[PDB]
Design an enzyme around this catalytic site. Structure first.
Site, PDB file in Angstrom:
ATOM      1  N   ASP A 257       1.229  -0.872  -0.010  1.00 31.57           N
ATOM      2  CA  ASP A 257       0.059  -0.006  -0.244  1.00 31.57           C
ATOM      3  C   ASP A 257       0.825   0.600  -0.307  1.00 31.57           C
ATOM      4  OD1 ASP A 257      -2.276  -1.744  -0.176  1.00 31.57           O
ATOM      5  OD2 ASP A 257      -2.197  -2.306   2.368  1.00 31.57           O
ATOM      6  N   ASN A 272      -0.035  -6.053   3.619  1.00 28.56           N
ATOM      7  CA  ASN A 272      -0.895  -6.432   3.631  1.00 28.56           C
ATOM      8  C   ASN A 272      -0.634  -8.407   3.692  1.00 28.56           C
ATOM      9  OD1 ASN A 272      -3.569  -8.669   3.636  1.00 28.56           O
ATOM     10  ND2 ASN A 272      -4.894  -6.367   4.283  1.00 28.56           N
ATOM     11  N   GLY A 276      -7.293 -10.190   0.303  1.00 27.08           N
ATOM     12  CA  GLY A 276      -9.079  -9.865   0.005  1.00 27.08           C
ATOM     13  C   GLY A 276      -8.943 -11.148  -1.095  1.00 27.08           C
TER      14      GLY A 276
END
Ligand SMILES: Nc1ncnc2c1ncn2[C@@H]1O[C@H](COP(=O)(O)O)[C@@H](O)[C@H]1O
Ligand SMILES: Nc1ncnc2c1ncn2[C@@H]1O[C@H](COP(=O)(O)O)[C@@H](O)[C@H]1O
Ligand code: NA
Ligand code: NA
Ligand code: NA
Lengths: 306, 303
Positions: A257, A272, A276
């Site tokens: 990010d 991360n 997802g």
């Protein structure tokens, strides 16, 4: 015999409902690829029993606490079962935004100017001393807990008089807090699959923060892939993202990010280590632009677990 | 109902024999203090069943792989059993000499001048270019794997010896460190909760304090020979180093001086030996603790 694969899903974190959907999507993609995969809702089934149950490999589709923080990775290491995504150290390290920032800073990788404060300083220092501590960062500021906690406890501080209440809020959630110079944006994420850097995505949150509502609930969040960056900027971002991911010892897959400041320089936010995996989540979006189907994506993630 | 405490010991790492001794000692000390403790050889008993077996709390007396590296800590976090020593992240981080160094560096903590090489670099760059990469460090040098005192370490006295060393190191890891040689002496500083115990000066038989050392030529000195003022500076530095890596409960910080008498941080050990010849028990004796007091105080920091 053929490998029996457990898809770990649901769990007990705040991100449970999103994880159910990730795990559902992963299962369908594994099924399309002919992999002998089974859904395991870890709220109901203890992860420590996976080897006993006959599984040979683990697809981690858990998000948040107990899924992406090193705890689960430690259990699977103890079981000696190969599993997807990053190992113990990287999984835990990526939750600790202070120590993430220390590693990156020592390497010369770009991060927003910041000040770290611990609870013993906060109890020792007056409001006016705390304002002086951060004066070099200017205004506005972002105040956040140091550890990842489903986006909670963050504030944007527009005036010095507001710092105190922002610190009080953050210190409800962690004993280390970070005060950062505000970055203008735009925001981006860069997915990584084994050696390969996927197309960046530009992220436009509806509010001030790319938080839990923005990531998981609102339809107002917008995403752009391709990102809009020039080829030269995309190349620079890709190399930066890979350096950041390796800095933290990440492996298998993940996403980095990044945000720009007003002049276009990139700053690293975090990595991360269990992203997802719903059909329209970031990593599947980046992978589709790269040329992979969802099925191929999950097969590849799984092939990287050894 | 008194708490039922497991003392995890033995296991399957290279350090198993040492861990049996540590565990035996720990178990005796805890019982001496009035704690209802049991020895659990994790080679025979799976740590995943500790809660099923009625244990309330765990003293970790394992060393090396699967003991001090975060994996066991992850299992005990999943079971929600309180345990001794550092948590998941610190336990794992402290294995990684590179990322330990980077954290300390960014905080302005003293470490030996060094150059880190990843594998892309080793295999790209020619022997002469690699000599040139580390020129600014001078000579002599230590070459080591980023993980694992075990195999893979060399002392390099001339530039021509470096290639051989880089090859021995890269058998073992894909982050390899080249550091300026520090003259010594070498010290270790045991930490118990917030409290720093008396420092120990360590004189290994040869170039490395490394396992054979951890011989019967290895000598320990406590008092260390430092002045009160240097002991205070060391103690503060050690605490800062330990807190920098998010350690807790107890542990041992390894430090060396250089030719100008400055201290340089080497590593933090998150599950120290507890045998009759081990360093933490010697520091604890020096502070006026019995071994039983020592282990009860470590257990009290688990909650
Ligand atoms: N210094 C900053 N300036 C502006 N926005 C930020 C800053 N740090 C965090 N954010 C926003 O908050 C989100 C969550 O922060 P973090 O978990 O630190 O990445 C980011 O994805 C950004 O939308
Ligand atoms: N830069 C250095 N100069 C001198 N001796 C070192 C150096 N680094 C490591 N050693 C020795 O090797 C041992 C193991 O190193 P390490 O695993 O980095 O903590 C230390 O306890 C020292 O005895
Ligand atoms: Na993580
Ligand atoms: Na759809
Ligand atoms: Na450790």
């Amino acid at each position: 015999m053929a490998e029996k694969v457990a898809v770990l899903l649901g769990g007990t974190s705040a991100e449970r409902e999103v994880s159910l959907l990730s795990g559902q999507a992963v299962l369908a993609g594994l099924k399309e690829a002919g992999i002998d995969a089974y859904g395991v809702d870890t709220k109901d089934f203890p992860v420590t029993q996976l080897k006993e149950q006959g599984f040979d490999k683990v697809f981690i589709a858990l998000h948040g606490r107990g899924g992406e923080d090193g705890t689960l990775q430690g259990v699977l290491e103890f079981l000696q079962l190969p599993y997807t995504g990053s190992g113990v150290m990287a999984s835990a390290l990526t939750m600790d935004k202070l120590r993430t920032k220390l590693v990156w800073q020592a390497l010369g990788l770009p991060i927003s100017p910041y000040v770290a404060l611990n609870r013993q300083q906060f109890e020792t220092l007056s409001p006016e001393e705390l304002v002086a501590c951060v004066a070099k960062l200017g205004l506005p500021l972002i105040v956040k807990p140091s550890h990842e906690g489903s986006s909670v406890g963050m504030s944007k501080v527009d005036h010095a008089s507001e710092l105190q209440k922002a610190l009080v809020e953050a210190f409800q959630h962690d004993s280390d807090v970070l005060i950062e110079k505000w970055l203008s944006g735009p925001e981006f994420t860069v997915a990584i699959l084994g050696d390969e850097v996927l197309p960046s995505i530009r992220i436009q949150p509806p509010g001030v923060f790319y938080d839990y509502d923005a990531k998981y609930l609102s339809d107002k969040t917008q995403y752009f892939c391709p990102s809009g960056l020039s080829d030269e900027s995309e190349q620079q971002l890709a190399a930066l993202a890979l350096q950041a991911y390796h800095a933290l010892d990440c492996s298998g897959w993940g996403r980095v990010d990044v945000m720009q400041d007003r002049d276009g320089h990139f700053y690293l936010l975090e990595v991360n280590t269990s992203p997802g995996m719903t059909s329209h989540s970031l990593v599947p979006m980046a992978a589709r632009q790269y040329g992979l189907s969802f099925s191929q994506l999950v097969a590849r993630i799984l092939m990287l677990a050894d």
